[PDB]
Amino acid sequence: ASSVHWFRKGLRLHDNPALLAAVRGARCVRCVYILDPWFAASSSVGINRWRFLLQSLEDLDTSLRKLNSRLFVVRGQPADVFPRLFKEWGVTRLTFEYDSEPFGKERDAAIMKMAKEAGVEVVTENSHTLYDLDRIIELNGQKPPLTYKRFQALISRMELPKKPAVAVSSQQMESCRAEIQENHDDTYGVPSLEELGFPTEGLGPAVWQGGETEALARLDKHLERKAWVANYERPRMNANSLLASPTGLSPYLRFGCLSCRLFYYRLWDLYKKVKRNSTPPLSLFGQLLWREFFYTAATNNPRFDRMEGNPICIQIPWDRNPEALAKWAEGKTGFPWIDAIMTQLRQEGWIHHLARHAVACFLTRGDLWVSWESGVRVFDELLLDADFSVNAGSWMWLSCSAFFQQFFHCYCPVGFGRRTDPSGDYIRRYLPKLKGFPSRYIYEPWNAPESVQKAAKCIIGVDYPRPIVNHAETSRLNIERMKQIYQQLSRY
Numbered sequence: 001a002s003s004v005h006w007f008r009k010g011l012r013l014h015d016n017p018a019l020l021a022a023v024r025g026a027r028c029v030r031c032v033y034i035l036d037p038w039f040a041a042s043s044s045v046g047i048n049r050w051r052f053l054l055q056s057l058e059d060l061d062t063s064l065r066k067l068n069s070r071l072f073v074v075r076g077q078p079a080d081v082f083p084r085l086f087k088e089w090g091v092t093r094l095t096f097e098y099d100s101e102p103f104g105k106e107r108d109a110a111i112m113k114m115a116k117e118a119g120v121e122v123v124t125e126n127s128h129t130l131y132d133l134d135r136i137i138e139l140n141g142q143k144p145p146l147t148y149k150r151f152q153a154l155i156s157r158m159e160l161p162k163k164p165a166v167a168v169s170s171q172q173m174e175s176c177r178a179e180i181q182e183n184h185d186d187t188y189g190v191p192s193l194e195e196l197g198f199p200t201e202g203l204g205p206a207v208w209q210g211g212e213t214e215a216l217a218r219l220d221k222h223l224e225r226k227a228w229v230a231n232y233e234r235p236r237m238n239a240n241s242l243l244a245s246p247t248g249l250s251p252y253l254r255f256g257c258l259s260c261r262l263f264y265y266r267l268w269d270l271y272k273k274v275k276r277n278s279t280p281p282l283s284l285f286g287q288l289l290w291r292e293f294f295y296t297a298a299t300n301n302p303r304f305d306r307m308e309g310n311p312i313c314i315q316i317p318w319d320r321n322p323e324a325l326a327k328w329a330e331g332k333t334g335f336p337w338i339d340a341i342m343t344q345l346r347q348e349g350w351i352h353h354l355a356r357h358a359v360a361c362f363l364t365r366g367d368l369w370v371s372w373e374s375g376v377r378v379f380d381e382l383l384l385d386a387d388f389s390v391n392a393g394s395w396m397w398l399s400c401s402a403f404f405q406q407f408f409h410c411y412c413p414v415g416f417g418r419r420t421d422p423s424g425d426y427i428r429r430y431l432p433k434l435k436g437f438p439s440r441y442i443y444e445p446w447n448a449p450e451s452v453q454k455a456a457k458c459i460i461g462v463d464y465p466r467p468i469v470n471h472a473e474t475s476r477l478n479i480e481r482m483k484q485i486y487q488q489l490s491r492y
């Protein structure tokens, strides 16, 4: 075979069954990522996401070099480029990791027709998720589970997730390496941010370095004693948790730099070491399982990220409020907790889950009454771990738009922050114009006596904006609106 392995997610060598399929019996293997650099033509994506991808690609290329090969980065779009690629390279097999996401599936079906037309074999393997999602759906009467509880019931009756696949052999690769030309970089090289047209003046090291090598190091650290105890054995929220963690895995999971199956098993194995003669609870895997739940929900729903025409979504008459949406996106709400979180997100590409809940509540049902759809869009742009399934699903969950929500109240834009970080140091860090404020006022600086504002060297409404809404009034009206909306839902 002359094989091509197409990277999309699954940006790793480890736990890559599709790659193994490409390699077996091949005369030549080429690994490709098809990159569309025409930014203007597509929804905006932030620098943090682009950089993470490029770094992930650099890492793969680096790893491939160890196998005497290279990454082929091909510029363009897949449907546009594949037919030429098949001819020019004489490909007989194409492999990739399966994509459950509805747009992804659609794209993939089209490529599969093209491949057939060209007499190219296609092998796909599901390694993005723990389980075979279609199986979960099948067991459920051919519809996705719409509660986490039902979802847990379904997997509970199922076989365990497959173990991570064996690594590709160095020698297996070497038996099939492709001719690398010495002009390779010009045509197939991994671009730099500068090259793609991003401004890099004064851009320091990424908070979340891309790639498989980083991801593997993080996993090992994640399972060392200190992280294990804090994460799993005795977990409690604290202010320091707000900060990006050297053991955070979520971006790596999103990009496929880290296998979910590897994480799941490494975690189980650690649990067994720690805990004698017990089987773990499902909650041990909760971060993964919530991810699976949303993927399962998404896969058959092309309208998943939309309100109107989405079968699982409550129809709610959201405000169109462009100015408000803009202030939220830019961290200029005048609520320092909300502003600080939005600042961290824009700057770094990750925020804590509780932080996401806070800003999402504020945008939607809590304060602004703007559609969750707008929130999804912003997160899509800025948030490293925000894919189609998890992002939309979470937003709909939070906003009480889907997944059967026996209500819980929205977080207070002031109280929650103060509770989460009483010191106020998180605010001081991300909104240093407010660093002067004492802790008692840093979350609600508008309430500070004028002498306080002056000592702080920050006059509210001059050096930092006033709060854009009155929370107590707004929340009261909103809570009533939500109650009315539920009341007006047909009961059965």
Ligand SMILES: CS(=O)(=O)N(Cc1ccco1)C[C@@H](O)Cn1c2ccccc2c2ccccc21
Residues within 6 Å of the ligand: 286, 287, 288, 290, 291, 353, 356, 357, 360, 379, 385, 386, 387, 390, 391, 394, 395, 397, 398
């Ligand atoms: C539903 S849950 O019980 O609270 N839990 C589900 C989960 C755990 C791991 C993956 O999902 C936390 C998520 O909701 C946190 N989260 C996101 C996680 C990834 C991408 C976007 C978001 C997002 C957007 C808005 C509000 C919260 C958000």
